[PDB]
Write a protein that binds this ligand. Structure first.
Ligand SMILES: O=C(c1cncnc1)N1CC[C@H](c2nc3ccccc3o2)C1
Length: 339
């Protein structure tokens, strides 16, 4: 309908204005108190912090510039911040501040206290089809938005989907997201979710995000992913074969949608045909979904996470607490000039 077309046209206008003139240097480290490490990886970490003047809580992602360079992530970290400061959608975590110093890059996001979807999935075992479908509809709308801005997300998995105070999803981690007209070539993403054309080192497009939504819906409704194996090479052989086995408890409508999203031939995959996202939105598995009501946040969620207030960390796990050290000398200034 024209209403959807005009919504996506305005979304692209507003994105391009911020894309062409990015904000920079909007806070500094000593405006915040450090509370707790919420997650740690090979070149960065995420910390709960409190702003000292307002008392508001935020999630601060800290990237070590020297490790970014060594792990070949310069372009990816510049993509992440430039895209996050330009997007606006109900199911995307909001960037509030960004800045850099002699040692680190910082992105200060809204803090979502209910934790990762992955923790709730593993606690309950699997989600019922109605519960899986409520989350899946939020991902379909978010990919419709991102793809219309020529963005590919490239890191869909349950650890990157946080559950908010109303039980809705907020997508975090734009470290692999990129603006792409046509094809792109980088090998990136988590093994269990990679589409075959990425594993085969082909030039690929937004169809890899719709493959990864098939893997996500399978894992939500089964409790484990479709292509599981002990080592990555074994996973990759299963993926490129595309042989999938479905639990008997899956509905016939869920199996049919999954066979069309987990289609090895990218030119036959739902989301990448002439009708685009509408082949997914109009599939029988989504017949009960009110797409406008989901966007408007008017549907009652399947569950609300248990937490005590905006500073509660009980839905995230425990990590060794390390210093946030800042060198007396500037590192890698040229590489990160635009940040
Ligand atoms: O704490 C938040 C959170 C994020 N955004 C808003 N609210 C909360 N985590 C913690 C776990 C997750 C996470 N992602 C990471 C990426 C790189 C390195 C470490 C990471 O740990 C998101």
């Amino acid at each position: 309908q024209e209403s959807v077309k005009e919504f996506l046209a305005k979304a692209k206008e507003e994105f391009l204005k911020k894309w062409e003139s990015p904000s920079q240097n909007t806070a500094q480290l000593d405006h915040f108190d450090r509370i707790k490490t919420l997650g740690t990886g090979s070149f960065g970490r995420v910390m709960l912090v409190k702003h000292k003047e307002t008392g508001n809580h935020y999630a601060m992602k800290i990237l070590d510039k020297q490790k970014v360079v060594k792990l070949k992530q310069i372009e990816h970290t510049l993509n992440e911040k430039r895209i996050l400061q330009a997007v606006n959608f109900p199911f995307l975590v909001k960037l509030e501040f960004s800045f850099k110093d002699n040692s680190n890059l910082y992105m200060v996001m809204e803090y979502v206290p209910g934790g990762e979807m992955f923790s709730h999935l593993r606690r309950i075992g699997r989600f019922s089809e109605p519960h899986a479908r409520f989350y899946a509809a939020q991902i379909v709308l978010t990919f419709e938005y991102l793809h219309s801005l020529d963005l590919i997300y490239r890191d869909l998995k349950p650890e990157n989907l946080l559950i908010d105070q109303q039980g809705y999803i907020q997508v975090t981690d734009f470290g692999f997201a990129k603006r792409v007209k046509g094809r792109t070539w980088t090998l990136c993403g988590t093994p269990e979710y990679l589409a075959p054309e990425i594993i085969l080192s082909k030039g690929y497009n937004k169809a890899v995000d719709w493959w990864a939504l098939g893997v996500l819906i399978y894992e939500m409704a089964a409790g484990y992913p479709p292509f599981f194996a002990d080592q990555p090479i074994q996973i990759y052989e299963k993926i490129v074969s595309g042989k999938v086995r479905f639990p008997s408890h899956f509905s016939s409508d869920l199996k049919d949608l999954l066979r069309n999203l987990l289609q090895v031939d990218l030119t036959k995959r739902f989301g990448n045909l002439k009708n685009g996202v509408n082949d997914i939105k109009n599939h029988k598995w989504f017949a009960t979904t009110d797409w406008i009501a989901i966007y408007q946040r008017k549907v009652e969620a399947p569950f609300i996470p248990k937490f005590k207030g905006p500073g509660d960390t009980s839905n995230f796990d425990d990590y060794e607490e390390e210093e946030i050290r800042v060198s007396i000398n500037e590192k890698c200034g040229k590489e990160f000039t635009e940040f």
